[PDB]
Amino acid sequence: GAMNSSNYAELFNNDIKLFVDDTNVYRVTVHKTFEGNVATKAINGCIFTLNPKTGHLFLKIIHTSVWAGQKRLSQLAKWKTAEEVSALVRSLPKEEQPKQIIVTRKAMLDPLEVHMLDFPNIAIRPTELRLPFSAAMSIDKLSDVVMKATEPQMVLFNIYDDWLDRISSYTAFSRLTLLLRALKTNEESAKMILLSDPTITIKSYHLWPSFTDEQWITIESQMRDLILTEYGRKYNV
């Protein structure tokens, strides 16, 4: 059934599962034409497929060429997402294939179910959680590889860096969703928080800065303050 606050620790058990987020698959800029009409121009997108237990991120880059000559792109984007997720699963050894795929938007359920008919024993689930994965393109290194791509491409990341050496996956996922929630609510402020101290750098093989345990506590506190404030600023409280 649907994943929610009540069945949350299931994310961190030993049943392989993937979150799939499609919010950045089909991306456009909206602009005026010379005649004064409006047009869209597609930019590169990405499927965000995440193992929440291990941090393994399968970032399938969606090049704008895939939309050429196609109609109803927002509908197509859901099916393309499902096609690529199904190809990912088929590319994995049996013992690495997920037991469950959790889609972050309910409109992905039928496309993915239809593409996964060959895998009757993989459960396709929605979620009641309002996960901030749309903000993945606020992570500079992920935005960079998406925007530089000249062809379809899959890039593999660990979105937790080396955190699992020191914290549990529950805690790592909590930190990830806090960071992303903050980046979604106020990207500029959130990014200032993360970099304000120039001595704390991002390793070449990492996405986030190399904070100590204590510095992560300060960072996390700053992200919660940001989120609460924007909540006031936005509802006036």
């Binding site: 099916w79 499902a82 096609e83 039928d110 496309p111 179910e113 239809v114 008919l117």
Partner: protein, 300 residues
Amino acid sequence: MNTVPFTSAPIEVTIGIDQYSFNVKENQPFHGIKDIPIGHVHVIHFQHADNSSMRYGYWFDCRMGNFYIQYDPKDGLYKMMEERDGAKFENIVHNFKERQMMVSYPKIDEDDTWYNLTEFVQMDKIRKIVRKDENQFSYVDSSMTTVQENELSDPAHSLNYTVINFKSREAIRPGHEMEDFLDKSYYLNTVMLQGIFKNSSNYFGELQFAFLNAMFFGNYGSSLQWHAMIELICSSATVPKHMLDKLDEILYYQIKTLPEQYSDILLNERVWNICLYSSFQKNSLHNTEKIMENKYPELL
């Protein structure tokens, strides 16, 4: 004109014959139904006065034999039987006819309702959906489940409707996932029509039989089957023109005949709104859309 005589009527019962029905009192001198039109299937059905649970009945075609109903006090129901002694059957039917203890099938001359509801329904196909090969007639009741329902428990007493499932490998060609799911023409025209049903007449016959079991017995799996067969056509962009015109006529008469008070349970709001207003065939069902909008605007 043919006759289904009755041994007796030991228990108070509402008897249906096609779209007609009448009340028989306990031990009333009722001995059957005469003047039944040859050329159509028919259904004789029963609801006991003491148990509005279990509507049940028998699909039959008088061309296939001489049939009669007798109440079984052990099994507690009116049973259809075949008398193979034709002499004895005409002899028994003439006796009861002379004593005027039979109701007349009360068809109005202008009235094509039953023909229009059973146009494609064939007894031989009914007997493949309802498997009981020793009899020439077929028993159905409110509780019988369908094969598809059994998959999601007694297979001998099931309704073997053709299984339709929009999210199945049969329905979806590898590499045409989005195409085949949004435009079911392949599934309709190649898998079902050419592959399984062979022709649209057999498809329409099963569709009409499923509707009638839903209406006369409240059979829920039958209702599911009827809507699925409608939805498959409406969700196909490419449908022969003759099929769309005939579907419009079939549905029109079904909606016309449905008891007004049962529209809440027998009509699936989603399917009908999709079929009439969103589907490829949204503009192809003029008669059906008009009677639906004038008779059940609430559902829409």
